[PDB]
Amino acid sequence: YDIVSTNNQLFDGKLVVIPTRAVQQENDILSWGQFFYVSTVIADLPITRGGHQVTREIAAIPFNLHVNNIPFALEFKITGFQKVMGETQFNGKLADLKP
């Protein structure tokens, strides 16, 4: 296995396990997903937007697709880090047993 991490807000204690071919070979269906990238074209043109003012508009137009191949995943919702490292787990319980 290998470990890949993100700081994306969407991932919050959400480890997901997915298979992939150990050696990637360009357009390989055995990749869990693929990113198909064509171009990112940037154009500039003084568009008279609204018919009563002109502004030069430099725009980037993405052109790409994400595709999933393998229908396998294991999703783990992992919480409680601060409860097992910030609190007694063994001696505290023995104290709770005190009459």
Partner: peptide, 16 residues
Amino acid sequence: SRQDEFAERIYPTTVI
């Protein structure tokens, strides 16, 4: 980058 290392490993880039 075109994709972050995270996105790239999951969705490797193929030029079309």
